[PDB]
Design a protein around this ligand. Structure first.
Ligand code: AGS
Ligand code: AGS
Ligand code: MG
Ligand code: MG
Lengths: 327, 315, 254, 258, 258
């Protein structure tokens, strides 16, 4: 049953109408398939944008419910070498379908992990067998693909999911599940996503599990912040306030108790304070220069280890000395 | 329709805008004959396979079909193939003009195994009067020294801005495309001496927008927004540069590596500011790039780089 | 409808043994003059084609052709109940969702009946057999099996070369090379051991050893095997049945 | 003490072949009237029960019963030394830590002797056999094996249905369905091929094919197999020995119960 | 050059069956008085040594010795074309890169010819056979195979002990212990079944069962096997051929040494 799959897998789009966010490429692909001229596709984009779902729904719309038999889907999990190409891909392209009549589809998912020799052998397979089969290459990094292979396919860049589409998908999930979501909670959820539907679905399932109730209540910002993890905005602003206004020893004690009560990390607090202070309308940019320089130096030092207490005191002193120029 | 890289693939050695010295060398060789064993090395997309194809075609005339043996990396090129098929082709009898020879083209020679490369030595040595070998590779170090000792070495270099610009102008004239100077400049900038990639990006921009303009090129082939990077670096106030970096580059999915590397290029090629301030900005950009290469690539590092650049510009 | 009764379930079991392993799906079609069946492997280099005339059966009735496709593996799984001596009757209506295999012993005693689920396969029987082949030869099938089994060990490719009065099988690989040379000859002491050869043109073709190995299975259906080769088409290896034949068409290696 | 000599090591080897695979631990007990053994599988759906009377042996001496438990796998590992024609003597003292298997050829020549480590098993022999079963039938065991081997391919469950003068085995699964129908008959040309059936009440039970497959092994001990079925208890499949028998009691599937 | 024709390809196939599995590389050398071959396993506890005199062949010609090394696996892969009744001719020039095996049927009909690639092996034939061994015994090889096959199941070590008129094979491991005791005897009803023993000194050596298992293969070449044991050297197990012999020298376990 589908009620056992996680929310990332349960809500996988099955038709091209369930793929939100991508409109300029989805409409163009639909037109390509309806009019017949479907060229070799290269779906390039970040993880969680919906490239695999898009190509799966496309193959479903093209071949019907028997997609799993008329399409050759290869990925990084399968052995993709030069001999694998030579045998499997060439035998698939040269032959015809065993279930119906029509062009074939080879979905090379995650083809950014293929060997250079494999791509050099495949670039002439794409150019030779081009009247009975097509090629779809999915990629997250366009630098791992040879320029020869990169030039034979039409490139489609999957942009990160915008606010409207991600809110539409959130509303669809809240309709499918007996769940309610607060508006500010929804905004905070969209903020910590960066256009990644996987993260949204995962944390939505997790906060539904956090509810502890039969779901007669709503999901507020507190639930998301306590469940999604990472220094809560409350503790973040409390530490920032104690650093900016309170005394040195009191600020040290506050930072220590905050980072030791929930086991928070100093790097997460650093990034959070950087994100919060970005909205601060400040005086002459010298304070911002000092703050950014010292915080980046402390982050680079943390990225290699050291004393957490010394680095926390360094963060406190850096923020304080940077703000002392604003007077 | 056929892509412009394949449709406008050069068929005569004069159409190649590559390295002039080696091109005239191969042209004189095809004119006089007596083609020796050769190994052409370089980088992808500079006219290596097309060069040897044009040389073989011009040298063999109509006998190209029965006098040229093409073996790519897509075909088996092991010890057994070199032992049987290459030797049978080299021993094959063929009546040719008194200035021509049978040509064995081996594309991607850097992928052949050590056994095949070792067996090819005497194969090319005993039949060096009726069979000639032309290797096309990207790394000459992958081919054993005994094989390199029996052949000429042609190292192809990157294509300068002028040659790629001339080839693109010829293609535009042959295709009647609407373009502009800044668009072609952005195309050549994103090509990085890669003629094949340049023609591919040009054709993609044409088929996607019709007009070859820098905005479209930085849109259909969007990667780091150079002009946007230049406007970010040339900002007068820190908040403006920070907002540009946040909205235009970071909120649109541009990776930090692309931002810093595009940043380095913009600076190196900058002319608005003096030399010393440019060197200091490159030094800051360089340190930021070093930090990112270690996996510390975030928005805070780029913000600190911009802050240090502004502090340098702050007299 | 389909109604075909084999005297001995064994004949059908050996026939299916021939499709076994090398193909997954088989398309059968019964009609007024008998039963035919075709199966093509995934790579499309091998076609297995069967023909069983009305006379090969103890009872055959057909007033309306029926085409039915099925999974070969499922069929063989069920094809070991024939006791070989059991009687086998294939039964199906005009628009079947299944094929019934009915095995019965002489006496009323034991009746094993199966209802095999069918697969829908687009009817598209191939007719790739040639009028004339470059060369034609027949020899004992056990001999052909040995020849194939020898050479197979040496390479994944076995070459068949034919010149006037000479047939030569060759394999050459890592450990070395091997060859089996046979010459045409009429043995009156029993002509089922003779080796005939009619050559209109010398031929020299290479085949994948894995496929020739699949093909040799036909030895169990006939004493002799006919091999027809051409430079223009797939080679034909044929095993005759009483009223019928099992044919294997194999595309030469390019 | 235990002192049992088999004329042919082969008989014991075939008997153990019957416990083999389907059970791990076997509890033997020798006594004045012979040897018995019981083994139950982990899921407790199958009981293998053996009885060998004094007359099945060439020599048997018992003045004091001994109970001994052992790992079936260990026993079979050792049970391929009998040459089949070798003589086999099982030996054990009254408080054993081991069981001795002694194989000897007619002549003094070769003597293979084993000392198998025993396991301690709480003595708890079951006595689940019924007075009357709903239906009783016997048929050649090779025929029963074929019937089981046929149907097994189709499903993990094989149903046995009995009505007046009719015995029907049925399997139905993914690829389709199958059935084997047999009828009672007396063959005078040799009655070891007859199929008898005594039905007091029609029965219809389902068994896990994996278990029936374990049970068919008894064919090697007897020409015929007796099958006794009831809606009140585990079914009994029995293979007679000269002075003895090997019995398999199998619990019907409830809907899902082997 | 090498030119040796075996009447029946079967003899050579059985000989190679003896080297099979237990060794990977074999070094052959043909000469005026026949063919010899030696192969040593990787651990160096087993040496397989062959000698085939000129008379074992139907035709043998040698005017110039040739030494050739080869992979045993490659050779056996090719050694199943003999039809057993086929004629086999081994052929090689004086400085070979290959060895030609030519199988032909009586009639001109079918000719299977192989060209096996050779390996370069430093010629270094061992001559470890002793003048006198502590004890010497021969018995039917099928009997020796059974003895080895029995005990092997019990342990990875099988001990051979010899005392006046007594030969005893013993294995002792996890499941228990076993022993096979045989006594010398002359059977006139057919002396190929006799068991001879000449003991100059009692011996007691242990061998790795995995190796004795490799050695028993020689049964297919001879009815009897000769076993020579010494406390000073590897044991010798020998299988005689018509004009020749196949010998297996096995180093005793030191305590842990195959
Ligand atoms: N545009 C979208 N609309 C709706 N759901 C989406 C969308 N993009 C992603 N998802 C969800 O995220 C899941 C994963 O999508 P994928 O297509 O596998 O991600 P991806 O774009 O292929 O990136 P990868 O696999 O990491 S390279 C889907 O099953 C959906 O539940
Ligand atoms: N000098 C040149 N003049 C004109 N077109 C060129 C030139 N060099 C490359 N091209 C174009 O690039 C295409 C491919 O060139 P190739 O010679 O295949 O690249 P390459 O230099 O061999 O590098 P590889 O093949 O990746 S190792 C040609 O078909 C042309 O369209
Ligand atoms: Mg994916
Ligand atoms: Mg190239």
């Amino acid at each position: 049953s589908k009620e056992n799959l996680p929310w990332v897998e349960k809500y996988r789009p099955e038709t091209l109408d369930e793929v939100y966010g991508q409109n300029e490429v989805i409409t163009t692909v639909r037109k390509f398939v309806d009019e017949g001229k479907l060229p070799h596709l290269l779906f390039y984009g970040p993880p969680g944008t919906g490239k695999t779902s898009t190509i799966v729904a496309l193959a479903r719309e093209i071949y019907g419910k028997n997609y799993s038999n008329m399409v050759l889907e290869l990925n990084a999990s399968d052995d993709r070498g030069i001999d694998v190409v030579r045998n499997q891909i060439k035998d698939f392209a040269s032959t015809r379908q065993i279930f119906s009549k029509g062009f074939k589809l080879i979905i090379l998912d995650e083809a950014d992990a293929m060997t250079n020799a494999a791509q050099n052998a495949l670039r002439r397979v794409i150019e030779r067998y081009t009247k009975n089969t097509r090629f779809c290459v999915l990629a997250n990094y366009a630098h791992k693909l040879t320029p020869a292979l990169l030039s034979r396919c039409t490139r489609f860049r999957f942009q990160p999911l915008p606010q409207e589409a991600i809110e539409r998908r959130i509303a669809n999930v809240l309709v499918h599940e007996k769940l309610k979501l607060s508006p500010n909670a929804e905004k905070a959820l969209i903020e910590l996503s960066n256009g990644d539907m996987r993260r949204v679905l995962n944390v939505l399932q997790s906060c539904k599990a956090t509810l502890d109730n039969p779901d007669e209540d709503e999901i507020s910002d507190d639930v998301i912040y306590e469940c999604c993890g990472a220094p809560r905005p409350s503790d973040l602003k409390a530490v920032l306030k104690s650093i900016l206004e309170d005394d040195w020893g009191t600020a040290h004690y506050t930072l220590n108790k905050v980072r030791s009560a929930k086991g928070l990390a100093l790097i997460d607090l650093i990034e959070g304070i950087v994100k919060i202070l970005e909205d601060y309308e400040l005086q002459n940019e010298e304070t911002r220069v000092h703050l950014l320089t010292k915080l980046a130096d402390i982050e680079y030092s943390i990225s290699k280890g050291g004393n957490d207490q010394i680095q926390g005191s360094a963060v406190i002193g850096a923020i304080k000395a940077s703000f002392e120029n604003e007077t | 329709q056929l892509p412009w890289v394949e449709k406008y693939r050069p068929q005569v050695l004069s159409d190649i805008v590559g390295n002039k010295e080696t091109i005239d060398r191969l042209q004189q060789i095809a004119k006089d004959g007596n083609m020796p064993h050769m190994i052409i090395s370089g980088m992808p997309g500079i006219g290596k396979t097309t060069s040897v194809h044009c040389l073989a075609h011009e040298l063999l005339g109509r006998s190209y079909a029965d006098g040229v043996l093409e073996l790519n990396a897509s075909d088996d090129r092991g010890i057994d193939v070199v032992r049987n098929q290459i030797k049978h082709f080299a021993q094959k009898k063929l009546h040719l003009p008194p200035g021509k020879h049978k040509i064995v083209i081996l594309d991607e020679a850097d992928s052949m195994t050590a056994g095949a490369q070792q067996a090819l030595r005497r194969t090319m040595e005993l039949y060096s009067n009726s069979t000639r070998f032309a290797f096309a590779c990207n790394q000459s170090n992958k081919i054993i020294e005994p094989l390199q000792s029996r052949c000429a070495i042609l190292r192809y270099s990157k294509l300068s801005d002028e040659d790629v610009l001339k080839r693109l102008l010829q293609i535009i004239k042959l295709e009647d495309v609407k373009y502009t100077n800044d668009g072609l400049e952005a195309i050549i900038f994103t090509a990085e001496g890669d003629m094949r990639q340049a023609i591919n990006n040009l054709q993609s921009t044409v088929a996607g927008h019709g007009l070859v303009n820098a905005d479209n090129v930085f849109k259909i082939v969007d990667s780091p927004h150079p002009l946007i990077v230049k406007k970010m670096l040339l900002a007068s106030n820190l908040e403006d540069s920070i907002q540009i970096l946040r909205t235009d580059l970071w909120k649109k999915g541009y990776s930090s590596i692309d931002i810093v590397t595009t940043s380095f290029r913009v600076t190196k090629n900058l002319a608005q500011v003096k030399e010393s301030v440019r060197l200091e900005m490159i030094k800051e950009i360089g340190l930021t790039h070093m930090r990112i290469l270690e996996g510390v690539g975030t928005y805070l590092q780029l913000a600190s780089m911009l802050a240090k650049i502004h502090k340098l510009n702050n007299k | 409808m389909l109604e075909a009764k084999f005297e001995e379930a064994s004949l059908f079991k050996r026939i299916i043994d021939g499709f076994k392993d090398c193909v997954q799906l088989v398309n059968f079609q019964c009609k007024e003059d008998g039963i035919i069946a075709q199966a093509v492997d995934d790579s499309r280099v091998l076609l297995v084609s069967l023909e069983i005339g009305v006379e090969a059966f103890q009872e055959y009735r057909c007033d309306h052709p029926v085409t039915l496709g099925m999974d070969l593996t499922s069929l063989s799984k069920i094809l070991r109940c024939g006791n070989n001596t059991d009687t086998l009757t294939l039964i199906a209506d005009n628009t079947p969702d299944s094929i019934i295999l009915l095995f019965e012993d002489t006496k009323k005693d034991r009746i094993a009946e199966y209802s095999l689920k069918l697969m829908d396969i687009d009817a598209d029987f191939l007719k790739i057999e040639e009028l004339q082949y470059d060369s034609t030869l027949s020899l004992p099938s056990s001999e052909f099996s040995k020849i194939v089994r020898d050479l197979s060990q040496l390479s994944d490719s076995i070459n068949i070369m034919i010149t006037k009065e000479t047939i030569k099988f060759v394999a050459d690989g890592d450990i070395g090379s091997g060859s089996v040379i046979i010459k045409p000859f009429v043995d009156m002491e029993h002509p089922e051991t003779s080796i005939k050869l009619e050559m209109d043109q010398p031929v020299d073709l290479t085949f994948g050893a894995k496929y020739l190995l699949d093909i040799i299975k036909g030895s169990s259906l006939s004493d002799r095997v006919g091999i027809r080769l051409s430079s223009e088409a797939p080679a034909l290896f044929q095993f005759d049945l009483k009223s019928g034949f099992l044919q294997f068409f194999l595309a030469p290696k390019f």
